[PDB]
């Protein structure tokens, strides 16, 4: 039946891959399809470098689609059509697997009396947009993602895997335009909503980690450089040559050093020429990280111009400019007084909160608690004799 195909793939494959094809024959036969579902997922992860993935999926998807997990038919498809260099093929097998499930729920739901197979339609749908993205038909993919989004909102429970793929797609769309900000904000949600199941490599996160870092530095609205590091994705990956100089670029911005920043940047302007054309935006971003940070940690909520001039290492002229741009962004808001040489703030936009800032916030409230307590002791002394 399908045993003959399995045998032919096995002669053709590498000796290391020969055990996997045998496992599939024995599990189908014993009719134990939990084992069979897991064993296939392991194949498509590790032997999609070998191009014997293309004829293997075909057998399982098209003859089982109610006898294997609702997640897993979509899993074997996504791997096979990822390394594919034809977009016509990528599109094709999606229209096919989409047909099976729409057909299936006309009968199945009735006999069975339960189970919805419409969850899997939405991943297929993320993947149709995905095909469009690589083919450079970005416009088409956008519409299909907005139609996906609608379905999500009217679901009572939305499992994490379904919205994970949606965000992956959305992430890809933004980096084609090169909208750093729009990519950064979409990617955090992708990272948070990432599945407890493993079938993602170390290598994939690595590629992503380069992409997160760059967006986070060459942005203009981004004052969280350890929101990267509260995910494993950039945190645990710092031990290569490329992700040393890169980790250091992030960290220099975090504590607001200009001296350390100068040393890195000088070198990496030559190396990375994406970084050189965007050098201007980055160079001032440092001063803006010092502006928001210094008024926050201090108890006074008005800052002099001379304070900013020494810290950021700039003329007094250049300082005003910086202040006006912070009001414009929404980094800070308030009034700019040139004559009295103040910037007196009325808003602090919410920031990354590290252990040191909590310590500050906690301290300041101890003083506040003592202030209330002392006033309270006075309020008890006057009027002790009569209250009512």
């Amino acid at each position: 039946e399908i045993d003959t195909i399995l045998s032919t793939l096995r002669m053709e494959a590498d000796p290391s891959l020969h055990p996997l094809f045998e496992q599939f024959e024995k599990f189908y036969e014993e009719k134990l399809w939990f084992q069979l579902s897991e064993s296939l997922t392991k194949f498509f992860d590790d032997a999609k470098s070998t191009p014997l993935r293309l004829r293997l999926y075909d057998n399982f998807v098209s003859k089982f689609y109610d006898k294997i997990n609702q997640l897993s038919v979509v899993k074997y498809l996504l791997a096979s059509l990822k390394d594919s260099k034809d977009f016509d093929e990528s599109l094709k097998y999606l229209d096919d697997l989409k047909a099976q499930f729409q057909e299936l729920d006309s009968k199945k739901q009735r006999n069975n009396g339960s189970k919805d197979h419409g969850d899997g339609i939405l991943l297929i749908d993320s993947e149709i947009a995905r095909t469009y993205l690589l083919k450079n038909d970005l416009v088409k993919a956008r519409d299909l993602l907005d139609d996906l989004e609608k379905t999500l909102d009217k679901k009572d429970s939305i499992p994490l895997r379904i919205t994970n793929s949606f965000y992956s797609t959305n992430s890809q769309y933004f980096k084609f335009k090169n909208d750093f900000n729009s990519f950064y904000y979409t990617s955090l949600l992708y990272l948070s909503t990432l599945e407890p199941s493993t079938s993602i490599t170390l290598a994939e996160r690595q590629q992503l980690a380069y992409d997160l870092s760059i967006s986070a530095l060459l942005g203009d609205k981004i004052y969280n450089f350890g929101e990267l590091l509260h995910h494993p994705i950039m945190e645990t990956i710092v031990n290569d040559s490329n992700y040393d100089w890169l980790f250091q670029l992030l960290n220099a911005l975090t504590v607001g050093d200009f001296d350390k920043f100068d040393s890195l940047i000088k070198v990496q302007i030559s190396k990375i020429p994406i970084l050189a054309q965007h050098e201007s935006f980055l160079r001032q971003k440092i001063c803006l990280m010092t502006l928001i940070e210094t008024v926050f940690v201090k108890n006074i909520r008005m800052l002099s111009f001379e304070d900013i001039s020494k810290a950021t290492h700039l003329p007094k002229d250049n300082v005003e400019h910086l202040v006006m741009r912070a009001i414009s962004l929404g980094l800070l808001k308030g009034s700019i007084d040139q004559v009295n040489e103040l910037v007196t703030i009325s808003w602090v936009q919410p920031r990354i909160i590290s252990g040191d800032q909590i310590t500050k916030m906690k301290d300041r409230l101890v003083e506040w608690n003592d202030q209330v307590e002392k006033l309270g002791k006075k309020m008890e002394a006057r009027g002790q004799s009569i209250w009512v």
Partner: protein
């Protein structure tokens, strides 16, 4: 070219006139039926008025007071032409300022009212008390779930 132009004018920026003029002279000024006609040379001249009114609006909001000596420099105008432009835009009722003729300051503010200031203060105190009242519930929530 059009995209950077629209973007500049929409968002709140500080910009200087001969540098913006230098950007769009070999670009937009040579596009006919806009700026490249003859009586559209005087629609180019008009582009400047719109740039120096943009800077006046921005600076009005964010700067509560600024010296007149400074304001001149940023706008790229002479002292006389600064005062008349402030004045016209105060007749048309959009902005408000008090400009000194000795040229010490311009106070881009309409001097705030007693009642409103007090009103503004009373509300902030209610926001602090509300903020603490909500916080205490979420402390209980986190500790026990841990």
């Amino acid at each position: 070219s059009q995209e950077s132009l629209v973007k500049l004018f929409t968002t709140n920026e500080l910009m200087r006139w001969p540098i913006v003029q230098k950007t769009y002279e070999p670009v937009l000024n040579e596009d006919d039926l806009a700026f490249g006609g003859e009586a559209n040379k005087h629609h180019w001249e008009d582009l400047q008025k719109r740039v120096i009114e943009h800077n006046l609006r921005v600076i009005s909001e964010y700067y509560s007071r600024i010296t007149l000596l400074r304001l001149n420099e940023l706008l790229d105008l002479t002292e006389s032409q600064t005062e008349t432009y402030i004045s016209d835009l105060v007749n048309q009722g959009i902005i408000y300022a008090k400009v000194n003729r000795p040229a010490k300051i311009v106070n881009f503010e309409k001097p705030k009212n007693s009642s409103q200031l007090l009103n503004e203060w009373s509300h902030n105190v209610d926001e602090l008390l509300e903020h603490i009242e909500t916080i205490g519930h979420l402390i209980t929530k986190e500790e026990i779930m841990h």
